[PDB]
């Protein structure tokens, strides 16, 4: 059934699984028309498909061309997400195919279940976790590849950089969720925390800076503070 805090260790066991987040698939700016009506203009989106154990991110870039002349785009976006995840699973060798796909939004369940009828042993599950994967587009190198695309593209990242050399996938997932929650809550302040010290850089083959273990503790503390500061600001508490 649904994946929660009771069964959190399940994410880091040896059963291949993927999180799928569809928040950034269909993206628009809303604007006034010359006649004073309102119109949307789509921008490039992406499917966020993540193995939480390995850090392997399957970033499917959704180019604005896929919406051309289509109707009910918010509905179509769910089915296009399901179509692309189904295509990714079919492209993977058998021993790499997931045993579970966890969707971040319940509206993905029927589209993904219907696209995956050919895979009755792949469980499609919701989660009670509130996961900040919508903030993926706050990671400069992911945002950059999405906005530069002139065509549908799949790009492969490790969202943990080289962290698994030093920490477990439980701790790497904890770190990722805290960074993405901070970027979602106050993007400017989060990026300032990550880049404030010019001596610590992002390797060409990485997404995040090259923090030592002691520096990750400091960054993580500054991220927690940011989230707590913003909660105080929101609720005047």
């Amino acid at each position: 059934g649904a994946m929660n805090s009771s069964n959190y260790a399940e994410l880091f066991n040896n059963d291949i699984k993927l999180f799928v987040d569809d928040t950034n698939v269909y993206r628009v700016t809303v604007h006034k028309t010359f006649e004073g009506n309102v119109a949307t203009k789509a921008i490039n989106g992406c499917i966020f498909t993540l193995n939480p154990k390995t850090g392997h991110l399957f970033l499917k870039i959704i180019h604005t061309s896929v919406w051309a002349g289509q109707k009910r785009l918010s509905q179509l976006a769910k089915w296009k997400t399901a179509e692309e995840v189904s295509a990714l699973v079919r492209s993977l060798p058998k021993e790499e195919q997931p045993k579970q796909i966890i969707v971040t939004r319940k509206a993905m369940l029927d589209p993904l279940e219907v696209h995956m009828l050919d895979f009755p042993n792949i469980a499609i599950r919701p989660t009670e976790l509130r996961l900040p994967f919508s903030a993926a587009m706050s990671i400069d190198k992911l945002s950059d590849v999405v906005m530069k695309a002139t065509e549908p593209q799949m790009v492969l990242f490790n969202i943990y950089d080289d962290w698994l050399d030093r920490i477990s996938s439980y701790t790497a997932f904890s770190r990722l969720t805290l960074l993405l929650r901070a970027l979602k809550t106050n993007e400017e302040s989060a990026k300032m925390i990550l880049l404030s010290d010019p001596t610590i850089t992002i390797k060409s083959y990485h997404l995040w800076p090259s923090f030592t273990d002691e520096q990750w503790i400091t960054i993580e503390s500054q991220m927690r503070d940011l989230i707590l500061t913003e909660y105080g600001r929101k609720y005047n508490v």
Binding site: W79, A82, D110, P111, E113, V114, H115, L117, D118
Partner: protein, 300 residues
């Protein structure tokens, strides 16, 4: 007009014949039902006074043979049997009619209710849903499961309704996932109507039979099949006009006949709200929408 004699009534029982019902007392001189209209299937059904467990009954057609009821004190139920001796049967009926020991099928001359509920129901199709080829009549009860309920257990005693599953490879063509899931026209018209039922009459027959087994036996799987067959039409954008017109008539008489006090157990809120107010055919069921809104507005 045809007759179903009873050997006797040794236990107190509520007897149904189609939409009618009568209480028989323990060892009352009851010897059966006369003046049963030729031209329709019928159902004769039972609920024991001392054990309301197992509603059970027999679908039969008087054109197919001479049928009587005899209580079996071993299996504890009223059994239908065929009498193969024509002149013995005529002689038993005659004696019981002369001594006025039979109830008359109480049909009002203005009253098309039973025809309206069984228009498409035929005994040969019932005998394919209920598999017992040694009898010309079909036994159904409260607890009999469907082939579909048994997939999700004795297959001999099952209701072989046509499996309908919206999230099945049968319902969804590869490459048309969104199209086929949101618009069931493929599933209804090519797979079910052209493919399995051959025509809308056979589809409406099974729908009407499912309803009657839900209502007369409280059979849960039957109720599921009746709703599934309604939702399959209502969730299709492309349905022949004659089919939508006939469906409205079919549903109207079903909703008209349903005991008011069984609406909470026999009617699925989700399916009806979806069929009447959200589906492609939300505007195609005027008669059904009007009776539902006037008789069961609490469901909607």
């Amino acid at each position: 007009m045809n007759t179903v004699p009873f050997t006797s009534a040794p236990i107190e029982v509520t007897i149904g014949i189609d939409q009618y019902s009568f209480n028989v007392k323990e060892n009352q001189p009851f010897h059966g039902i006369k003046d049963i209209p030729i031209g329709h299937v019928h159902v004769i059904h039972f609920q024991h006074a001392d054990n309301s467990s197992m509603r059970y009954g027999y679908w039969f057609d008087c054109r197919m043979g001479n049928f009587y009821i005899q209580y079996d004190p071993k299996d504890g139920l009223y059994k239908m049997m065929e009498e193969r001796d024509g002149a013995k049967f005529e002689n038993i009926v005659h004696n019981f009619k002369e001594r006025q020991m039979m109830v008359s099928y109480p049909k009002i001359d203005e009253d098309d209710t039973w025809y309206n509920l069984t228009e498409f129901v035929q005994m040969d199709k019932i005998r394919k849903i209920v598999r017992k080829d040694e009898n010309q009549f079909s036994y159904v009860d409260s607890s009999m499961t469907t082939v579909q309920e048994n997939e999700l257990s004795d297959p001999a005693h099952s209701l072989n309704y046509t499996v309908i599953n919206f999230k099945s490879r049968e319902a969804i063509r590869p490459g048309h996932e969104m199209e086929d899931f949101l618009d069931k026209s493929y599933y209804l018209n090519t797979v079910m109507l052209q493919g399995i039922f051959k025509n809308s009459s056979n589809y409406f027959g099974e729908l009407q039979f499912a309803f009657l087994n839900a209502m007369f036996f409280g059979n849960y799987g039957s109720s599921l099949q009746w709703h599934a067959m309604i939702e399959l039409i209502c969730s299709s954008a492309t349905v022949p006009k004659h089919m939508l017109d006939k469906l409205d008539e079919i549903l109207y008489y079903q909703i008209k006949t349903l005991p008011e006090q069984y609406s909470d157990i026999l009617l699925n809120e989700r399916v009806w709200n979806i069929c009447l107010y959200s589906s492609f055919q939300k505007n195609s069921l005027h008669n059904t929408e009007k009776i539902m809104e006037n008789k069961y507005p609490e469901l909607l």
